[PDB]
Motif scaffolding. Structure first.
Motif, PDB file in Angstrom:
ATOM      1  N   UNK A  65      -7.044  16.226   2.528  1.00 10.26           N
ATOM      2  CA  UNK A  65      -7.671  16.075   1.214  1.00 10.26           C
ATOM      3  C   UNK A  65      -9.180  16.133   1.406  1.00 10.26           C
ATOM      4  N   UNK A  66      -9.907  16.614   0.408  1.00 13.80           N
ATOM      5  CA  UNK A  66     -11.354  16.756   0.527  1.00 13.80           C
ATOM      6  C   UNK A  66     -12.143  15.718  -0.243  1.00 13.80           C
ATOM      7  N   UNK A  67     -11.462  14.708  -0.755  1.00 15.22           N
ATOM      8  CA  UNK A  67     -12.183  13.696  -1.494  1.00 15.22           C
ATOM      9  C   UNK A  67     -12.577  12.552  -0.567  1.00 15.22           C
ATOM     10  N   UNK A  68     -12.620  11.373  -1.165  1.00 15.63           N
ATOM     11  CA  UNK A  68     -13.002  10.170  -0.464  1.00 15.63           C
ATOM     12  C   UNK A  68     -12.131   9.843   0.753  1.00 15.63           C
ATOM     13  N   UNK A  69     -12.750   9.513   1.888  1.00  9.36           N
ATOM     14  CA  UNK A  69     -11.936   9.066   3.021  1.00  9.36           C
ATOM     15  C   UNK A  69     -11.884   7.518   2.844  1.00  9.36           C
ATOM     16  N   UNK A  70     -10.681   6.987   2.646  1.00 11.21           N
ATOM     17  CA  UNK A  70     -10.486   5.566   2.445  1.00 11.21           C
ATOM     18  C   UNK A  70      -9.843   4.967   3.681  1.00 11.21           C
ATOM     19  N   UNK A  71     -10.565   4.079   4.361  1.00 10.39           N
ATOM     20  CA  UNK A  71     -10.065   3.388   5.554  1.00 10.39           C
ATOM     21  C   UNK A  71      -9.671   1.954   5.184  1.00 10.39           C
ATOM     22  N   UNK A  72      -8.416   1.581   5.459  1.00  6.87           N
ATOM     23  CA  UNK A  72      -7.965   0.246   5.148  1.00  6.87           C
ATOM     24  C   UNK A  72      -7.692  -0.531   6.432  1.00  6.87           C
ATOM     25  N   UNK A  73      -8.363  -1.684   6.559  1.00  6.47           N
ATOM     26  CA  UNK A  73      -8.221  -2.553   7.715  1.00  6.47           C
ATOM     27  C   UNK A  73      -6.941  -3.361   7.614  1.00  6.47           C
ATOM     28  N   UNK A  74      -6.183  -3.405   8.705  1.00  2.00           N
ATOM     29  CA  UNK A  74      -4.942  -4.157   8.727  1.00  2.00           C
ATOM     30  C   UNK A  74      -4.828  -4.682  10.148  1.00  2.00           C
ATOM     31  N   UNK A  75      -4.849  -6.001  10.293  1.00  5.65           N
ATOM     32  CA  UNK A  75      -4.816  -6.592  11.627  1.00  5.65           C
ATOM     33  C   UNK A  75      -6.004  -5.998  12.368  1.00  5.65           C
ATOM     34  N   UNK A  76      -7.159  -5.987  11.712  1.00  5.90           N
ATOM     35  CA  UNK A  76      -8.350  -5.431  12.355  1.00  5.90           C
ATOM     36  C   UNK A  76      -9.269  -6.537  12.786  1.00  5.90           C
ATOM     37  N   UNK A  77      -9.965  -6.321  13.898  1.00  5.69           N
ATOM     38  CA  UNK A  77     -10.910  -7.302  14.378  1.00  5.69           C
ATOM     39  C   UNK A  77     -12.018  -6.470  15.003  1.00  5.69           C
ATOM     40  N   UNK A  78     -13.276  -6.878  14.865  1.00  2.00           N
ATOM     41  CA  UNK A  78     -14.350  -6.083  15.431  1.00  2.00           C
ATOM     42  C   UNK A  78     -14.367  -6.115  16.946  1.00  2.00           C
ATOM     43  N   UNK A  98       0.806  -1.203   0.000  1.00  3.03           N
ATOM     44  CA  UNK A  98       0.000   0.000   0.000  1.00  3.03           C
ATOM     45  C   UNK A  98       0.852   1.271   0.000  1.00  3.03           C
ATOM     46  N   UNK A  99       2.156   1.138   0.206  1.00  2.00           N
ATOM     47  CA  UNK A  99       3.003   2.324   0.237  1.00  2.00           C
ATOM     48  C   UNK A  99       3.172   3.035  -1.104  1.00  2.00           C
ATOM     49  N   UNK A 100       3.405   2.287  -2.175  1.00  2.00           N
ATOM     50  CA  UNK A 100       3.556   2.933  -3.475  1.00  2.00           C
ATOM     51  C   UNK A 100       2.242   3.615  -3.793  1.00  2.00           C
ATOM     52  N   UNK A 101       1.168   2.994  -3.323  1.00  2.00           N
ATOM     53  CA  UNK A 101      -0.159   3.502  -3.562  1.00  2.00           C
ATOM     54  C   UNK A 101      -0.438   4.825  -2.908  1.00  2.00           C
ATOM     55  N   UNK A 102       0.272   5.150  -1.837  1.00  2.00           N
ATOM     56  CA  UNK A 102      -0.010   6.417  -1.151  1.00  2.00           C
ATOM     57  C   UNK A 102       0.064   7.672  -2.011  1.00  2.00           C
ATOM     58  N   UNK A 103       1.085   7.752  -2.845  1.00  3.17           N
ATOM     59  CA  UNK A 103       1.272   8.917  -3.705  1.00  3.17           C
ATOM     60  C   UNK A 103       0.110   9.056  -4.672  1.00  3.17           C
ATOM     61  N   UNK A 104      -0.227   7.964  -5.316  1.00  9.02           N
ATOM     62  CA  UNK A 104      -1.344   7.988  -6.223  1.00  9.02           C
ATOM     63  C   UNK A 104      -2.595   8.430  -5.474  1.00  9.02           C
ATOM     64  N   UNK A 105      -2.821   7.888  -4.283  1.00  8.59           N
ATOM     65  CA  UNK A 105      -4.023   8.237  -3.532  1.00  8.59           C
ATOM     66  C   UNK A 105      -4.048   9.716  -3.199  1.00  8.59           C
ATOM     67  N   UNK A 106      -2.904  10.233  -2.760  1.00  9.55           N
ATOM     68  CA  UNK A 106      -2.806  11.650  -2.446  1.00  9.55           C
ATOM     69  C   UNK A 106      -3.165  12.453  -3.679  1.00  9.55           C
ATOM     70  N   UNK A 107      -2.569  12.085  -4.808  1.00  9.78           N
ATOM     71  CA  UNK A 107      -2.843  12.800  -6.032  1.00  9.78           C
ATOM     72  C   UNK A 107      -4.312  12.717  -6.412  1.00  9.78           C
ATOM     73  N   UNK A 108      -5.024  11.732  -5.876  1.00 13.54           N
ATOM     74  CA  UNK A 108      -6.437  11.596  -6.169  1.00 13.54           C
ATOM     75  C   UNK A 108      -7.306  12.296  -5.139  1.00 13.54           C
ATOM     76  N   UNK A 109      -6.645  13.052  -4.268  1.00 18.03           N
ATOM     77  CA  UNK A 109      -7.344  13.826  -3.264  1.00 18.03           C
ATOM     78  C   UNK A 109      -8.151  12.927  -2.322  1.00 18.03           C
ATOM     79  N   UNK A 110      -7.571  11.764  -1.980  1.00 13.48           N
ATOM     80  CA  UNK A 110      -8.179  10.770  -1.097  1.00 13.48           C
ATOM     81  C   UNK A 110      -7.518  10.915   0.264  1.00 13.48           C
ATOM     82  N   UNK A 111      -8.281  10.784   1.332  1.00 11.99           N
ATOM     83  CA  UNK A 111      -7.722  10.876   2.677  1.00 11.99           C
ATOM     84  C   UNK A 111      -7.584   9.452   3.162  1.00 11.99           C
TER      85      UNK A 111
END
Ligand SMILES: O=P(O)(O)C(O)(Cc1cccc(-c2ccc(-c3ccccc3)cc2)c1)P(=O)(O)O
Ligand SMILES: O=P(O)(O)C(O)(Cc1cccc(-c2ccc(-c3ccccc3)cc2)c1)P(=O)(O)O
Lengths: 218, 214
Positions: A112-125, A71-84
């Motif tokens: 960023x004012x676009x989509x807030x994207x939450x990614x679960x990692x080692x998540x449990x309810x 997901x790290x390489x993806x961060x730049x692209x996401x930022x450029x897409x105005x995603x939080x």
């Protein structure tokens, strides 16, 4: 927006089955799964959804490293897409480089004012409810909180994503009809949408289908 | 093997209207479906059946207890009411307590009736208990874990919920069980509660069985 949906959570499942059906290895399924993640995120951004929370279900400590590392390489692209970007889950056991990287990424996209994207990692309810509980236990041990003052709304302030719109819709691809310890507290009133489509094939039209189901369901 | 089924009973009023009858008529049919479902579960070795009515009733509750408790006991059914009953009138509270006491030693089906219950409320009652142990000093905030919290949520002494059925058409848990359904199979049917019968129930159990395999 028209569909009335502000926050969608997706349990992504089926990449492996998908690959195997093609006679291909898991790596192929992962390439296809990432491609489906990119498409679901743009779809959400382009459709006025405020928040998208993604959970990869697996058919362990290191795996959740790779996963979040990729997901790290993806961060730049996401930022450029105005995603939080936000990572939810137990990353307290992740080396502190990641935790910094993670917080940098969160810092970076924070405004960023676009989509807030939450990614679960080692998540449990259950874990999620527990960390919020520990936080209330601390205030108790400090003599600031009286057990009887603790109510739903208070605990609600300490579970993941409390600051975002409540989850309206949870989609689970892959055919299974279980929550598998993904969100629990947060889905008390959410519409639940189960589809047999495997994650690699889940597209814009499948996502539209789930939103319209929610739109008409409510 | 499905050991504990939880059902969100929905559709009584909508059902009544379909027949061109009044709400009270749906209730009547609603209660017969409950009787049928409970017989069915006991009849098939299910260890626990948990019923949630999804939407005066305090007197009728007294009556359902006073009238059906005897048969359930005869059927070796253990009855428990889950939810916040702290504000029901004392007579109903007493009736609930005696009915529970009466059937506590039964070894057949444990039938849990959720009354004034909410999944969040349930987790919060457990949290409050753990907070008490912290306030006192016999519990360190970071000693609290999943297992511990699990020991203070309703039904922790019973088999884990394997299957949640919601009749009536909606696809939501509606703040019914939350902590408890982390690994439960969820089965939704458009059948209205009054029409939910043995065949519908087995269909869901078959779904659980077939899916448990694949
Ligand atoms: O779907 P599964 O259970 O078959 C499996 O692919 C795990 C998985 C589930 C959902 C999503 C993904 C997944 C999510 C995201 C990415 C990804 C996203 C961005 C960049 C690189 C890789 C790759 C793969 C993987 P598994 O590793 O268990 O075979
Ligand atoms: O071990 P590798 O190097 O063969 C490989 O798995 C690396 C990888 C790439 C993309 C995604 C993932 C991955 C995706 C998702 C998860 C995962 C998701 C949820 C729960 C547990 C584990 C673990 C790993 C792994 P690849 O995709 O190249 O086959």
């Amino acid at each position: 927006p028209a569909h009335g949906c502000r926050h969608v959570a997706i349990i992504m499942d089926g990449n492996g089955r998908w690959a195997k059906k093609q006679g291909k290895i898991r790596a192929f399924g992962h390439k296809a799964g990432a491609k489906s993640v990119r498409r679901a995120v743009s779809f959400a951004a382009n459709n006025g959804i405020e928040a998208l929370t993604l959970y990869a279900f697996s058919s362990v400590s290191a795996l959740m490293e790779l996963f979040v590392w990729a997901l790290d390489s993806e961060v730049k692209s996401l930022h450029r897409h105005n995603v939080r970007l936000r990572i939810i889950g137990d990353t307290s056991r992740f080396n502190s480089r990641l935790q910094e990287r993670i917080r940098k990424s969160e810092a970076l996209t924070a405004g960023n004012t676009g989509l807030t994207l939450n990614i679960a990692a080692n998540y449990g309810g259950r874990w999620d409810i527990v960390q919020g509980v520990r936080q209330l236990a601390e205030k108790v041990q400090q003599g600031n909180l009286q057990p009887d003052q603790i109510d739903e709304e208070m605990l609600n302030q300490h579970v993941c994503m409390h600051e975002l719109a409540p989850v309206d819709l949870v989609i689970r691809t892959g055919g299974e009809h279980r929550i598998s310890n993904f969100l629990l507290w947060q889905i008390a009133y959410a519409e639940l949408y189960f589809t047999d489509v495997l994650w690699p094939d889940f597209d814009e039209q499948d996502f539209e289908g789930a939103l319209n189901a929610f739109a008409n369901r409510e």
